[PDB]
Amino acid sequence: SNPETIRRASSSMSVNVLKGDAIKNYALSEKQYIPFFGSSELSRISPFHPSVLAEKYQRNYRPFLLGAPGTQSLSQYMMMRSAGDAMKNKKVVFIISPQWFVKNGVKTDYFNTYYSELQTYDWLFSMKKVTPADRYLARRLLTFSKVKENDTLTAILQTIKKGKLPLPESLNQLRSQWNMLKREDEVFDRQQKIDHESKRLPKQYQETELSILANQIGERETTNNPFGLKNDFYTHRIRAHEPELKQSQKNWDYRFSPEFSDFQLVLDQLAKNHNEVLFIIPPVNEKWSDYTGLSQEMLQGFAKKIKFQLNSQGFNRIADFVNQAGTNYFMEDTIHLGWKGWLAADQQIRPFLEENHITASKYHLDDAFFSKSWQHQIPDKLQL
């Protein structure tokens, strides 16, 4: 609970922090820590990363990074729900990755990495009534073998799936294990890189000076391939298979997925907490999609669909960057925001978190977004 430990934790993306309670919930209880949800893009520390800009320009917040490689909506819902009241009324930044929204949803391997018995039990002991969100989550959890290993939990989830509140005597069978997990959590570093990158920035914030610097760094760091990819990413992840990747994504589609309904869990909790949220939708590097055949029209349809889900329920603060696919150096690689992209995000993050302007969101949740109909809905006929 030492302040330097919390600061270190706020940028660690440590799986033990993301699956735990003691550190993240204390930090979220402090006014200064603003949760940034997302996935692996949050580890892209450069001079333009949100934590570097906030530190260099002495802003009144510090991001607490809660995404990590493979964290999608279900895992981040569990983080939010287990924080409970620590999240009430906070501002939130949430990066929506289009790649999460694949036909079969979050890979089992990703779910298993972040599955937290502590946070699952937190939810169960928090429930006072069964809402459609609770029924959906129980239905989802019951499809993962790691959850099924636990017979006591499985029977409780079956009760919730049927719409019934588990009896206290039933939940009490988990209480000993829950308390053990809580004690262990109570008892059991990127700051130097953030500081280093901060020294590369101008003393005074000036967006165009920053843009020029982002273009200079991007150009210097993408010299070994034709696609605008960071050199080490190209060398380690692309080069060995580069011929085979041509046209490999021509039939990929992110418009249909259980992830739309997992994402609805996030929206349910954000609304119940009265969170004000900035959602960010990144593009895919157009030089790369040109090569792989991934359809930009399809990505625009994904964005239309997710924006309908957001806007129809009152989430109207959205930085949609899908149309920045052709902006050099917007992405660091094939999926992760990079120098110009993080700088562009700052143009909406900064006035939100610093309250240059203030708007009030009022939410109207619709449980239809948990349905298979929504998961399979084609975006083109949607109209608000």
UniProtKB/TrEMBL annotation:
Taken from the record, one Pfam family name reads DltD
UniProt keywords, alphabetically: Cell membrane, Membrane
Which pathway features in its UniProt record?
Cell wall biogenesis; lipoteichoic acid biosynthesis
TM annotation in the entry: none
| InterPro entries in the record | DltD (IPR006998), LTA_DltD (IPR023896)
GO biological process assignments: lipoteichoic acid biosynthetic process
The organism's place on the tree of life at top rank: Bacteria
Q: Name one GO cellular component term.
A: plasma membrane
Q: Which family does it belong to?
A: Belongs to the DltD family.
Mind telling me what this protein is named?
Answer: Protein DltD
